[PDB]
Enzyme design. Structure first.
Site, PDB file in Angstrom:
ATOM      1  N   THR A 141      -6.644  -5.607  -8.892  1.00 53.20           N
ATOM      2  CA  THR A 141      -8.074  -5.758  -8.626  1.00 53.20           C
ATOM      3  C   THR A 141      -8.510  -7.218  -8.608  1.00 53.20           C
ATOM      4  O   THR A 141      -9.386  -7.594  -7.827  1.00 53.20           O
ATOM      5  CB  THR A 141      -8.877  -4.966  -9.662  1.00 53.20           C
ATOM      6  OG1 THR A 141      -8.587  -3.563  -9.536  1.00 53.20           O
ATOM      7  CG2 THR A 141     -10.390  -5.231  -9.532  1.00 53.20           C
ATOM      8  N   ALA A 153     -11.941   4.976  -4.418  1.00 49.68           N
ATOM      9  CA  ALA A 153     -11.530   6.316  -4.003  1.00 49.68           C
ATOM     10  C   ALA A 153     -11.024   6.260  -2.561  1.00 49.68           C
ATOM     11  O   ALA A 153     -11.452   7.024  -1.691  1.00 49.68           O
ATOM     12  CB  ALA A 153     -12.672   7.314  -4.173  1.00 49.68           C
ATOM     13  N   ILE A 154     -10.066   5.352  -2.318  1.00 55.60           N
ATOM     14  CA  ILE A 154      -9.587   5.064  -0.961  1.00 55.60           C
ATOM     15  C   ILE A 154      -9.036   6.325  -0.301  1.00 55.60           C
ATOM     16  O   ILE A 154      -9.347   6.631   0.852  1.00 55.60           O
ATOM     17  CB  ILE A 154      -8.516   3.958  -1.006  1.00 55.60           C
ATOM     18  CG1 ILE A 154      -8.990   2.710  -1.800  1.00 55.60           C
ATOM     19  CG2 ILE A 154      -8.081   3.588   0.395  1.00 55.60           C
ATOM     20  CD1 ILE A 154     -10.223   1.983  -1.286  1.00 55.60           C
ATOM     21  N   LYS A 198       0.817  -1.212   0.000  1.00 55.33           N
ATOM     22  CA  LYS A 198       0.000   0.000   0.000  1.00 55.33           C
ATOM     23  C   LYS A 198       0.858   1.273   0.000  1.00 55.33           C
ATOM     24  O   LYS A 198       2.031   1.248   0.399  1.00 55.33           O
ATOM     25  CB  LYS A 198      -0.943  -0.057   1.218  1.00 55.33           C
ATOM     26  CG  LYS A 198      -1.996   1.037   1.371  1.00 55.33           C
ATOM     27  CD  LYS A 198      -2.693   1.337   0.037  1.00 55.33           C
ATOM     28  CE  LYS A 198      -3.956   2.178   0.218  1.00 55.33           C
ATOM     29  NZ  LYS A 198      -4.318   2.880  -1.056  1.00 55.33           N
ATOM     30  N   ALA A 199       0.303   2.380  -0.486  1.00 52.30           N
ATOM     31  CA  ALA A 199       1.040   3.629  -0.492  1.00 52.30           C
ATOM     32  C   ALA A 199       1.420   4.028   0.930  1.00 52.30           C
ATOM     33  O   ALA A 199       0.638   3.869   1.872  1.00 52.30           O
ATOM     34  CB  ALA A 199       0.209   4.735  -1.140  1.00 52.30           C
ATOM     35  N   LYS A 243       5.567   5.250 -11.281  1.00 52.48           N
ATOM     36  CA  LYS A 243       4.296   4.630 -11.671  1.00 52.48           C
ATOM     37  C   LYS A 243       3.461   5.648 -12.432  1.00 52.48           C
ATOM     38  O   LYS A 243       2.986   6.630 -11.850  1.00 52.48           O
ATOM     39  CB  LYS A 243       3.519   4.113 -10.464  1.00 52.48           C
ATOM     40  CG  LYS A 243       2.189   3.487 -10.836  1.00 52.48           C
ATOM     41  CD  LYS A 243       1.687   2.604  -9.713  1.00 52.48           C
ATOM     42  CE  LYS A 243       0.531   1.749 -10.163  1.00 52.48           C
ATOM     43  NZ  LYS A 243      -0.103   1.048  -9.038  1.00 52.48           N
ATOM     44  N   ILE A 303      -0.125   0.515 -15.546  1.00 54.05           N
ATOM     45  CA  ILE A 303      -0.605   1.849 -15.242  1.00 54.05           C
ATOM     46  C   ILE A 303      -1.319   1.919 -13.902  1.00 54.05           C
ATOM     47  O   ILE A 303      -1.835   0.932 -13.402  1.00 54.05           O
ATOM     48  CB  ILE A 303      -1.587   2.333 -16.314  1.00 54.05           C
ATOM     49  CG1 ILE A 303      -2.761   1.363 -16.346  1.00 54.05           C
ATOM     50  CG2 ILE A 303      -0.932   2.393 -17.682  1.00 54.05           C
ATOM     51  CD1 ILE A 303      -3.897   1.824 -17.165  1.00 54.05           C
ATOM     52  N   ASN A 360       5.511   1.352  -2.441  1.00 56.82           N
ATOM     53  CA  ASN A 360       4.773   2.447  -3.044  1.00 56.82           C
ATOM     54  C   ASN A 360       4.874   3.680  -2.167  1.00 56.82           C
ATOM     55  O   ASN A 360       4.572   3.612  -0.972  1.00 56.82           O
ATOM     56  CB  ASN A 360       3.304   2.031  -3.213  1.00 56.82           C
ATOM     57  CG  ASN A 360       2.570   2.843  -4.266  1.00 56.82           C
ATOM     58  OD1 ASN A 360       1.980   3.887  -3.956  1.00 56.82           O
ATOM     59  ND2 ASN A 360       2.612   2.368  -5.530  1.00 56.82           N
ATOM     60  N   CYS A 376      -1.061  11.479  -7.720  1.00 58.99           N
ATOM     61  CA  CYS A 376      -1.618  12.129  -6.534  1.00 58.99           C
ATOM     62  C   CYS A 376      -1.871  13.602  -6.849  1.00 58.99           C
ATOM     63  O   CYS A 376      -1.292  14.127  -7.808  1.00 58.99           O
ATOM     64  CB  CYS A 376      -0.652  12.054  -5.330  1.00 58.99           C
ATOM     65  SG  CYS A 376      -0.025  10.436  -4.811  1.00 58.99           S
TER      66      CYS A 376
HETATM   67  C1  LIG Z   1      -8.703  -0.374  -4.031  1.00 57.02           C
HETATM   68  C2  LIG Z   1      -7.520   0.064  -4.847  1.00 57.02           C
HETATM   69  C3  LIG Z   1      -6.500   0.695  -4.173  1.00 57.02           C
HETATM   70  C4  LIG Z   1      -5.382   1.117  -4.855  1.00 57.02           C
HETATM   71  N1  LIG Z   1      -4.414   1.750  -4.162  1.00 57.02           N
HETATM   72  C5  LIG Z   1      -3.296   2.160  -4.795  1.00 57.02           C
HETATM   73  C6  LIG Z   1      -2.188   2.830  -4.066  1.00 57.02           C
HETATM   74  O1  LIG Z   1      -2.268   3.022  -2.827  1.00 57.02           O
HETATM   75  N2  LIG Z   1      -1.104   3.224  -4.769  1.00 57.02           N
HETATM   76  C7  LIG Z   1      -0.999   3.006  -6.102  1.00 57.02           C
HETATM   77  O2  LIG Z   1       0.033   3.390  -6.702  1.00 57.02           O
HETATM   78  N3  LIG Z   1      -1.978   2.392  -6.825  1.00 57.02           N
HETATM   79  C8  LIG Z   1      -3.111   1.958  -6.248  1.00 57.02           C
HETATM   80  N4  LIG Z   1      -4.103   1.339  -7.003  1.00 57.02           N
HETATM   81  C9  LIG Z   1      -3.870   1.120  -8.433  1.00 57.02           C
HETATM   82  C10 LIG Z   1      -3.346  -0.315  -8.566  1.00 57.02           C
HETATM   83  O3  LIG Z   1      -2.020  -0.410  -8.028  1.00 57.02           O
HETATM   84  C11 LIG Z   1      -3.286  -0.834  -9.983  1.00 57.02           C
HETATM   85  O4  LIG Z   1      -2.128  -0.299 -10.614  1.00 57.02           O
HETATM   86  C12 LIG Z   1      -4.488  -0.435 -10.790  1.00 57.02           C
HETATM   87  O5  LIG Z   1      -5.627  -0.741  -9.992  1.00 57.02           O
HETATM   88  C13 LIG Z   1      -4.480  -1.197 -12.127  1.00 57.02           C
HETATM   89  O6  LIG Z   1      -4.316  -2.625 -12.015  1.00 57.02           O
HETATM   90  P1  LIG Z   1      -5.553  -3.621 -11.726  1.00 57.02           P
HETATM   91  O7  LIG Z   1      -6.571  -3.220 -12.760  1.00 57.02           O
HETATM   92  O8  LIG Z   1      -5.078  -5.061 -11.905  1.00 57.02           O
HETATM   93  O9  LIG Z   1      -5.957  -3.270 -10.287  1.00 57.02           O
HETATM   94  C14 LIG Z   1      -5.256   0.877  -6.325  1.00 57.02           C
HETATM   95  C15 LIG Z   1      -6.275   0.229  -7.003  1.00 57.02           C
HETATM   96  C16 LIG Z   1      -7.402  -0.187  -6.323  1.00 57.02           C
HETATM   97  C17 LIG Z   1      -8.471  -0.887  -7.113  1.00 57.02           C
HETATM   98  O1  LIG Z   2      -5.675   5.232  -2.443  1.00 52.38           O
HETATM   99  C1  LIG Z   2      -6.317   5.477  -3.500  1.00 52.38           C
HETATM  100  O2  LIG Z   2      -7.500   5.915  -3.526  1.00 52.38           O
HETATM  101  C2  LIG Z   2      -5.647   5.223  -4.813  1.00 52.38           C
HETATM  102  C3  LIG Z   2      -4.307   5.529  -5.024  1.00 52.38           C
HETATM  103  C4  LIG Z   2      -3.767   5.258  -6.273  1.00 52.38           C
HETATM  104  O3  LIG Z   2      -2.574   5.520  -6.501  1.00 52.38           O
HETATM  105  N1  LIG Z   2      -4.541   4.721  -7.226  1.00 52.38           N
HETATM  106  C5  LIG Z   2      -5.830   4.446  -6.972  1.00 52.38           C
HETATM  107  O4  LIG Z   2      -6.559   3.941  -7.838  1.00 52.38           O
HETATM  108  N2  LIG Z   2      -6.376   4.687  -5.785  1.00 52.38           N
END
Ligand SMILES: Cc1cc2nc3c(=O)[nH]c(=O)nc-3n(C[C@H](O)[C@H](O)[C@H](O)COP(=O)(O)O)c2cc1C
Ligand SMILES: O=C(O)c1cc(=O)[nH]c(=O)[nH]1
Ligand SMILES: Cc1cc2nc3c(=O)[nH]c(=O)nc-3n(C[C@H](O)[C@H](O)[C@H](O)COP(=O)(O)OP(=O)(O)OC[C@H]3O[C@@H](n4cnc5c(N)ncnc54)[C@H](O)[C@@H]3O)c2cc1C
Ligand SMILES: Cc1cc2nc3c(=O)[nH]c(=O)nc-3n(C[C@H](O)[C@H](O)[C@H](O)COP(=O)(O)OP(=O)(O)OC[C@H]3O[C@@H](n4cnc5c(N)ncnc54)[C@H](O)[C@@H]3O)c2cc1C
Ligand SMILES: Cc1cc2nc3c(=O)[nH]c(=O)nc-3n(C[C@H](O)[C@H](O)[C@H](O)COP(=O)(O)O)c2cc1C
Ligand SMILES: O=C(O)c1cc(=O)[nH]c(=O)[nH]1
Ligand code: FES
Ligand code: FES
Ligand SMILES: [Cl-]
Ligand SMILES: [Cl-]
Lengths: 262, 306, 306, 262
Positions: free
Chosen positions: B267, B69-70, B44-45, B166, B192, B100, B131
Site C-alpha cells: 500500500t 475490493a479490486i 498482480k494476481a 500467502k 499477510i 501471484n 479467495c
Molecule cells: C489495491 C490492492 C490490491 C491488492 N491485490 C492483491 C492481489 O491481487 N493478490 C494478493 O495476493 N494480494 C493483494 N493485495 C494484498 C497485498 O499484497 C498486501 O499483502 C496487503 O495489502 C498487505 O500489505 P500492505 O499493507 O503493505 O499493502 C492487495 C492489496 C491492495 C491494497
Molecule cells: O484483487 C483484490 O481485490 C484483492 C486480492 C487479494 O488477494 N487481496 C486483496 O486485498 N485484494
C-alpha cells in the site's frame, strides 16, 4: 527531467467560494505541463490519510513557474479540509502532472467550440479556454452550479475574448434558473468539438445530446489510490472493447465519448 | 552485500519486494525509477481466465490504511504469459519475479501453476489462497487446513518452481493452516494478505465500496501482521516473506525481529512512489543505528533467539 | 431529545458510553467534566478475585492505534461492590453503569453475575468473553459457540439485570457465535473488543510488551469493527452497542449505518479527555449535516433498509 | 479554573544538546504549577500517533506565564522527532500539570540536600533546585551523562548559589570519568533529603545506597497512555502494600523510596 513528484510551495490560498479553495503552487512541475485537463495527486498533511487527493489543474503560468487549482473541502474530518489549513509558504507533496488531458491540436479558427461545465468540474476548463483562445476559434461556455454560493471562475471566463459565457444556477440565485443542460438545449449552431466536465448526471446528459459527435471530450472522475495506473482502482468499462477496463487516472482523465457508457 | 538475502528460488540483491496488487506488472512505476534496484516483484494476481474485477468504488481511505475490493482484475494466463511477463523479462532479465496465482477452484490454480513457471523470469509462485472457493460455497481456501493442504499438494505437483503460500489473517487460529501448508510441500510463506473492513457513506448510508466489504491494509495492520508472523515463525521451518503496513526501513527491520526473511511493500507505494528505492538506500544507515551486521545474519540470530 | 436511545436496561440520555478499560470507574475523568453528560459508562472488568494484571510495559503505540496488555487489573468483586460502584452511585445516582464482567472459568463469571446486579446503579452486565479459559487450555470463550453459549446460559440464570455479550473480532466467522449467544438469552451485544498485535523493539529485538501480544484498538480498527457489526446485525435481532476506533460524531453516525444503537468510545479518551462530551455536543450539528431525525429513528430506518 | 488541558504557544525551541530540545511554552497552565517534578502530557502533531508523550517540567516563570521542558528525540519515525519540527509560534496540545511532584515544604536551611540526576532525568531537577534555593539549604548536585554530547543544564545549575555541582560523563569527555554513582560514594556528610531522577540503573544504585533514609524521593518513568490514572498502564508494585499497584502518572511520578522495589 520528468520529475513526476515534487514538494511544491503554496504561493497563496484563499476561499474563493463556499468551501472551495484556490491554491497557487510554485515548483518545477509546471514546466512539464502541456495539455489542459491533467491533474495533480496531492498528499494530505495528515499522516493517518495515506491516499492522495486527485485535483484537476485549473491553469498555469510557465514563466512564473506556478499552477492553480480549485477544490472543494469536506467536513472537519475530511482530508481536503486539512489541505485548506495549509498557508502561504508551506510545502505540499505533489505527484504530477498526470493523465491524458483535453486535446487542442487539431482545432482551428473556423470550427465552433462548445464547453459545458458544472460544480467543481469548472477549474480544468479554464486552462482549456486559455489555450483554445490562442487558436482564435469561437467559444460558447455554459457553466452550471448548485447555487450562487458555489459559483467559481466567472470573472476569469468573462475576461476571455471569443467567449459567449452563460451561467446557470439550480436555484436561480444567479443567472439562469436551472441546470446547465437547459442552456445546452438552447444553443443554435453546429458544434464541431465539445469539452465537458462536471457531475455524472451532467456528463450523462451532455453525452446523450451529442452521441453523434466524434470530437466530444469528456473529463471523468473515480475513486483513486495509486494515481498512475497500477492498482486498477479507478476503472471504467470500455465501450469500444467490451470486458476491457479504462483507467481514469492513466488512460483518462479525459476520454472521447465513444469510449464511455455515461 | 549487507542487504542480500537468499531464499528458495530467490537470490535477492536486497529484501524489498513490491507487494501483489500494488505494482501491476511493474510497467507504471518503472517510469519513476530503475526497477533493477528492487529485490523482486510480486506481480498482480493471475487467474486462468481474464477478469474485469468488481464494480466501483473499489477503494476507500481509512485511518492509516485503505480498503480495496479490486476483485482480481487481470488479463488472464495467456495474456500474462505472452505480454506482461515477457515485458519484464526484456527490460529486467535478471530481476526475479514472484507470480501471484489466484483462482476460483482447485483445477484453475493447478492449471495456472502448470504453465506459469515456463516464464524464464518467474522464479517463485505465491499461492493466493485468500479467495472464495465455489466448489465449497464461497468459503476461502485459506480458512480450512484440509482444503488448503489439498490445494497446495495438487499445485505442488505441476510447478517447475518453488511454491510459497500467502496466508490470510482473518482466522481464529493461524497455526493449524501453516503447519498443514508446510507439510503439503510449500517452500515458503508470505503473510499477510488483508484484513476485512467496511466504510459507510454518511450521505447515502450505503457502504462506500460497491463490494460492501474490502481488504484493509496499510500501517494500521502492521501490528496484526507482526503478531501472526511471530506466531507462525515458531511453528514452521520454511522462510517467511512478511508484509502488512511496511513503510520504513525501521518497519522492515521489525519484520525481521518477527522472523521474516524479506519484506514486501504494498500500500505504501500509493503514497510515495519512490518508497521502495527510498527504503533500500535508507536500510544500511538504519541497520547501523541498531547494530545489525547483514540481513542474512539477522535471519539466523532471530531464528536462534527465537 | 434527538440523542436519546432506549435499550434493554438502558434509558440513555444520549448514546456515548466510555468503553471498558478506558475509564476506570470514572473517578479520574470526573475531575475533567461532569459525568452526567454521558449516556452511560462501561466500567473496567470485574473479576471474582483481585488481579494485579500483567507485567509492564503494558501499552505500545501503533499507527492510528495502540496496543494494551493490561491483564484485567481490578480490585475484585468485593471491593468493586463496596467502594467503586457505590462511589458512582453517590456522585451520579441517575447515571446507568455497564458492568464489564471477566473471568478465568465459568463458575467465576457466574459468581460475579449473581452479585453485581445488586448494585443499584448497575443496569446492564457486559460479558467479556474475550479472556482465556483454563477449563479448556487457555482457549477464549469467545471462539467456541458451544462454550460461549454455555457460559451465557449459566450466567443468564443468576443475573437480576439484562446481559449483553462483548464479541471478540479474532474469529474466522463471527456469525455462528452471535447466533449462539443470542439463542442463549443475551439481551444485547457489544462489539468489538480488540484485535491482536505485536510490536518489537529495534534496540533489544524483543517484543515491546512484556506480554508479547496485546490488544489493538484505536481508529486503525474502525473498518474491522464496522464490518463485523454490519455482519452480525444481519443475523440477530438483539441490539448492538458498537465500538472500535470511534473518535468523532461522524464515526458515531457511521456505527449507526452499520446497525449499532449506541456507541462506546474507548482509546480516544487517552488522546482527548473531553472527547466524549465533545462528541455529544457536536452530534446534533453533524446529524443535521446528513439529514438525520433522531437516533431512535435512525436505528429503525437502518434496521429496515437493512 | 483547574484547566487540565490547553493549546499552549511555543515561545521558542532550539537543540541544546545532541538530539535534546528545549521548548519554552506560554499558556495559562503555568499558573497551576506548584511542586517541582510534575509533568506534561504532550500530543504529537501527527494524527497517526494518538498516545501523548509525557515530559517532565524543567522550570517555569509564573509571571512570564511560561514553562520550560527538555526532551530527547528518537529517529525520524519517532513522535518526539515530529515535536522538534514545530517552530516558534506553533500551538501544542498539552495536558497538565500532572502527578505528584517533589515535596519541598518540610525542608529548612539546616538540613543538607543531595540531588542526583542523569541523562534526561536532569530537567525536572532544575526547578527543584530553584525552589530549594529559596529555603537557603545547602545543596550538592551530582549529574551524570553518557557523554559530553548529551550534557544539559550545566550553566543553569552553576548559576544557582548554595550549590556544589559535580558533573560526570561515562566516557570522561567532560568532568569526572564514570557514572554518577561514583561521585555519590565520594560524598562525606549526613544527607537529610535526597531527590533523584534518571535511568533505572542509576535510580537502583541511589535507592540501595540510601535504603535507610525516609526523606528519599525518587522520580519514576513508565509507559503511559491515559496520563491521569484510569487505564492502569504505568503500574509499579507497591512495596508497602503487596499486590497493590502504584500508578506512575497519578500516584507518581515521584515516590518515597519505601514505596518502590528498585
Ligand atoms: C489495491 C490492492 C490490491 C491488492 N491485490 C492483491 C492481489 O491481487 N493478490 C494478493 O495476493 N494480494 C493483494 N493485495 C494484498 C497485498 O499484497 C498486501 O499483502 C496487503 O495489502 C498487505 O500489505 P500492505 O499493507 O503493505 O499493502 C492487495 C492489496 C491492495 C491494497
Ligand atoms: O484483487 C483484490 O481485490 C484483492 C486480492 C487479494 O488477494 N487481496 C486483496 O486485498 N485484494
Ligand atoms: C481526475 C479528478 C480530478 C478532480 N478534480 C477536482 C477539482 O479540481 N476540484 C475538486 O474540488 N474536486 C476534484 N475532484 C474530486 C476530489 O478528488 C474530491 O473532492 C476529494 O478527493 C475528496 O476527498 P476529501 O479529502 O474531500 O474527502 P474524504 O472523504 O476525507 O476522502 C476519502 C477518500 O475518498 C475519495 N473520494 C471521496 N469522494 C470523492 C469524489 N467525489 N471523487 C474522487 N474521490 C473521492 C478521496 O479521493 C479519498 O481517497 C477530482 C477527482 C478526480 C478523480
Ligand atoms: C513522567 C515522565 C517524565 C519524562 N520526562 C522526560 C523528559 O523530561 N525528557 C525526556 O527526554 N524524556 C522524558 N521521558 C521519557 C519520554 O516520555 C520518552 O522519551 C518519549 O515519550 C519517547 O517517545 P518518542 O516519540 O521519542 O518515541 P516513540 O518510540 O515514537 O514512542 C512510542 C510510545 O512509546 C513510549 N515510550 C518509548 N520509550 C519510552 C521511555 N523511555 N519512557 C516512557 N515512554 C516511552 C512513548 O511514550 C509512546 O507512548 C519521561 C517519561 C515519563 C514517564
Ligand atoms: C487499555 C485498554 C484496556 C481495556 N480494557 C478492557 C476491559 O477490561 N474489558 C473489556 O471488555 N475491554 C477492554 N478494552 C477494549 C475496549 O473496551 C474497546 O472495546 C476496544 O479498545 C475497542 O474500542 P476503542 O478502539 O475505541 O478502544 C480495553 C482497551 C484498552 C485500549
Ligand atoms: O485488561 C486487558 O488487558 C484487556 C481486556 C480486554 O477485554 N480487552 C483488552 O484489550 N484488554
Ligand atoms: S488510481 Fe491506481 S489504477 Fe487508477
Ligand atoms: S497512564 Fe493511564 S494509568 Fe497511568
Ligand atoms: Cl478465472
Ligand atoms: Cl479472578
Amino acid at each position: 527531467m520528468p520529475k513526476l513528484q515534487e514538494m511544491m510551495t503554496i504561493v497563496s490560498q484563499r476561499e474563493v467560494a463556499s468551501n472551495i479553495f484556490e491554491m497557487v503552487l510554485k515548483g518545477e512541475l509546471v514546466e512539464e505541463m502541456d495539455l489542459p485537463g491533467q491533474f495533480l495527486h496531492l498528499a494530505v498533511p495528515n499522516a493517518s490519510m495515506l491516499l492522495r487527493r486527485p485535483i484537476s489543474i485549473s491553469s498555469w503560468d510557465k514563466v512564473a513557474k506556478t499552477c492553480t487549482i480549485l477544490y472543494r473541502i469536506g467536513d472537519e474530518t475530511s482530508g481536503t479540509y486539512e489541505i485548506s489549513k495549509l498557508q502561504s509558504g508551506a510545502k505540499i507533496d505533489v505527484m504530477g502532472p498526470l493523465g491524458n488531458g483535453f486535446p487542442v491540436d487539431e482545432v482551428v479558427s473556423t470550427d465552433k467550440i462548445l464547453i459545458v461545465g458544472g460544480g467543481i468540474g469548472v477549474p480544468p476548463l479554464y486552462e482549456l479556454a486559455k489555450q483554445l483562445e490562442e487558436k482564435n476559434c469561437q467559444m460558447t461556455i455554459l457553466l452550471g452550479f448548485a447555487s450562487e454560493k458555489v459559483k467559481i471562475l466567472e470573472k476569469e471566463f468573462a475576461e476571455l475574448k471569443n467567449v459567449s459565457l452563460k451561467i446557470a444556477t439550480d436555484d436561480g440565485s444567479y443567472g439562469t434558473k436551472g441546470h446547465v443542460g437547459m442552456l445546452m438545449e438552447e444553443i443554435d449552431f453546429e458544434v464541431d468539438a465539445l469539452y465537458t466536465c462536471g457531475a455524472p448526471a451532467m456528463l450523462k446528459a451532455v453525452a446523450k445530446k451529442y452521441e453523434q459527435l466524434e470530437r466530444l471530450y469528456i473529463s471523468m472522475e473515480s475513486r483513486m489510490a495509486c494515481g498512475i495506473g497500477a492498482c486498477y482502482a479507478c476503472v471504467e468499462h470500455d465501450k469500444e472493447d467490451e470486458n476491457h477496463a479504462l483507467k481514469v487516472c492513466e488512460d483518462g482523465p479525459v476520454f472521447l465519448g465513444k469510449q464511455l457508457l455515461l | 552485500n549487507r542487504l542480500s538475502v537468499k531464499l528458495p528460488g530467490l537470490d535477492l540483491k536486497n529484501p524489498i519486494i513490491p507487494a501483489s496488487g500494488c505494482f501491476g506488472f511493474g510497467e507504471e512505476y518503472a517510469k519513476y525509477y530503475d526497477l533493477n534496484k528492487l529485490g523482486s516483484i510480486m506481480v498482480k494476481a493471475t487467474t486462468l481466465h481474464p477478469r474485469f474485477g468488481n464494480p466501483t468504488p473499489r477503494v476507500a481511505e481509512t485511518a492509516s490504511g485503505m480498503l480495496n475490493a479490486i476483485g482480481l482484475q487481470n488479463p488472464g494466463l495467456e495474456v500474462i504469459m505472452a505480454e506482461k511477463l515477457p515485458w519484464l523479462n526484456e527490460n529486467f532479465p535478471d530481476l526475479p519475479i514472484i507470480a501471484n496465482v489466484a483462482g476460483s477452484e482447485e483445477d484453475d490454480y493447478v492449471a495456472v501453476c502448470a504453465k506459469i513457471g515456463d516464464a524464464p523470469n518467474v522464479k517463485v509462485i505465491e499461492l493466493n489462497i485468500s479467495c472464495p472457493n465455489v466448489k465449497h460455497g464461497g468459503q476461502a481456501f485459506g480458512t480450512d487446513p484440509d482444503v488448503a493442504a489439498a490445494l497446495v499438494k495438487a499445485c505442488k505437483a505441476v510447478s517447475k518452481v518453488p511454491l510459497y503460500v500467502k496466508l490470510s489473517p482473518n482466522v481464529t487460529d493461524i497455526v493449524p493452516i501453516a503447519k498443514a501448508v508446510e507439510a503439503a510441500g510449500a517452500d515458503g510463506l508470505t503473510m499477510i494478505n488483508t484484513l476485512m473492513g467496511v466504510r459507510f457513506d454518511l450521505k447515502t448510508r450505503k457502504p462506500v465500496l460497491a463490494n460492501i466489504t474490502g481488504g484493509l491494509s496499510g500501517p494500521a495492520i502492521k501490528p496484526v501482521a507482526l503478531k501472526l508472523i511471530h506466531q507462525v515463525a515458531q511453528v514452521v521451518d520454511i522462510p517467511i516473506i512478511g508484509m502488512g503496513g511496511v513503510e520504513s526501513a525501521q518497519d522492515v527491520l521489525e519484520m525481521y525481529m518477527a522472523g521474516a526473511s524479506a519484506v514486501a511493500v504494498g500500500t505504501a507505494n500509493f503514497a510515495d512512489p519512490f518508497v521502495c528505492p527510498k527504503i533500500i538506500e535508507k536500510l544500511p544507515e538504519v541497520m547501523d543505528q541498531y547494530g545489525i551486521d547483514s540481513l542474512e545474519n539477522l535471519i539466523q540470530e532471530v531464528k536462534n533467539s527465537k
